[PDB]
């Protein structure tokens, strides 16, 4: 994708009625992170799912480690959560030459405030000002009132932990229902006039 969503407003593409081989991503090896849960990454192109959800967003390098089942942290709890029984793959790569700008690429936002934690795969993109204190905000930013999101300082001089990374998470939904997303199971040449 030309552009990825902010982690607070991560995109979700529902994938159905199609075919692809997961090992392609593996083999290209453009990633710094490539970890699967539930399903092995080792060419598991023989599995079919009802749906596949490809979630995507941009975060800092030091945040990549939070995108996983069993994790806690500012993203894992308030921007993007994965379930304990998640089946899926987390792929991430350094996007410093795409998502960084001179002066800082502040087009990417993350949530700092919420009154509760997110559910697995919950997306909440509300811009209503958060009340941290006891008095009402009445739409005004101030001490004890925070517009819930903040931008990332994605500067050209950032060290690796502060460089932007593109994260794509593939959730594999297996239901007692007809499957629609499978891999391109390998075929061979037709051979005629011989025992086959």
């Amino acid at each position: 994708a030309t552009r990825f969503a902010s982690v607070y407003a991560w995109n979700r593409k529902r994938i159905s009625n199609c075919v692809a081989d997961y090992s392609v991503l593996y083999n290209s090896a453009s990633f710094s992170t490539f970890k699967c849960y539930g399903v092995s990454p080792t060419k598991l192109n023989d599995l079919c799912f009802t749906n596949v959800y490809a979630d995507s967003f941009v975060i800092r390098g030091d945040e990549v480690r939070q995108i996983a089942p069993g994790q806690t942290g500012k993203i894992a709890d308030y921007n993007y959560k994965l379930p304990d029984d998640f089946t899926g793959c987390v792929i991430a790569w350094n996007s410093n030459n795409l998502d960084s700008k001179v002066g800082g690429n502040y087009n990417y936002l993350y949530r700092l405030f919420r009154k509760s934690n997110l559910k697995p795969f919950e997306r909440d993109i509300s811009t209503e000002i958060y009340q941290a204190g006891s008095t009402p905000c009445n739409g005004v930013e101030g001490f004890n009132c925070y517009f819930p999101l903040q931008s990332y300082g994605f500067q050209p001089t950032n060290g690796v932990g502060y460089q932007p990374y593109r994260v794509v998470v593939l959730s594999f939904e297996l239901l007692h229902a007809p499957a629609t997303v499978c891999g391109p199971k390998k075929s061979t040449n037709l051979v005629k006039n011989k025992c086959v």
Epitope: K74, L112, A132, G133, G142, F143, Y146
Partner: antibody, heavy 120, light 108 residues
Framework: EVQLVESGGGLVQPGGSLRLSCAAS????????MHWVRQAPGKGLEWVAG????????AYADSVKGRFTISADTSKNTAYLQMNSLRAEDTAVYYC?????????????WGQGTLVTVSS | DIQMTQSPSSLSASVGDRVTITCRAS??????VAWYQQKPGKAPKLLIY???DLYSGVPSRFSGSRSGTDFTLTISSLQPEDFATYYC?????????FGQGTKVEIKR
């Protein structure tokens, strides 16, 4: 490189005043809140006051409310604490520190502080 | 007016040993709590901000995590330069309060 430098401490008589000043460099003040933090010898840290540099809005700890006023100047890239009617209870090392936005953020840079004492 | 309780007042762990200090907010502090390191005669240095963000210039040995209102301050392995009094600050709301300070010693 970001630096914060305190001045304006020293000995005052009770009921008198001292004006702390924090020079700053390496960043602007706008978009940040400037804060003063107090620490009595042998004690932990206490927030005293804060100002949002781009708004002029302030917040104060109850413990110094009324007696202290906080201000900042974005053209000068400096900030001040005006401490009036100083009490024996206000003897402490004062530090300037900064955090991003009005609040909700920790303090990245700290100066080394100055000692403020009150004694008859 | 969210108060912070820090425990223990002192902790011992020898060089190479792991340190965990717990900071408890009396109310939700969101993810606006910061961890500072103080040496005698010096201003507190920021180690970790907004609960889990390691501050640039701070050794990778420093880390931390959250459960509810409990903020765990962790040093994966102590070196002689890490024996300091550690403090938590709650920037979520005003006034800003701090914990009491935990002194780390060497298990002599």
């Amino acid at each position: 490189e970001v630096q914060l430098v305190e001045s304006g401490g020293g000995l005052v008589q009770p009921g008198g005043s001292l004006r702390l000043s924090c020079a700053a460099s390496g960043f602007d003040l706008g978009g940040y809140s400037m804060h003063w933090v107090r620490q009595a010898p042998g004690k932990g840290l206490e927030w005293v006051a804060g100002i949002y540099a781009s708004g002029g809005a302030t917040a104060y700890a109850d413990s110094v409310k009324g007696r202290f006023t906080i201000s900042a100047d974005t053209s000068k890239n400096t900030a001040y604490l005006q401490m009036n009617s100083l009490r024996a209870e206000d003897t402490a090392v004062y530090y300037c520190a900064r955090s991003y936005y009005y609040g909700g953020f920790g303090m990245d840079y700290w100066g080394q502080g100055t000692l403020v004492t009150v004694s008859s | 007016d969210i108060q912070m309780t820090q425990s223990p007042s002192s902790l011992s762990a020898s060089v190479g040993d792991r340190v965990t200090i717990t900071c408890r907010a009396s109310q939700s502090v969101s993810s606006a709590v910061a961890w500072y390191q103080q040496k005698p005669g010096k201003a507190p240095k920021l180690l970790i901000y907004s609960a889990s963000d390691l501050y640039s210039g701070v050794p990778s040995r420093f880390s931390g995590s959250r459960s509810g209102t409990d903020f765990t301050l962790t040093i994966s392995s102590l070196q002689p330069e890490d024996f300091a009094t550690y403090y938590c600050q709650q920037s979520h709301t005003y006034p800003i309060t701090f914990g009491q300070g935990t002194k780390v010693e060497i298990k002599r």
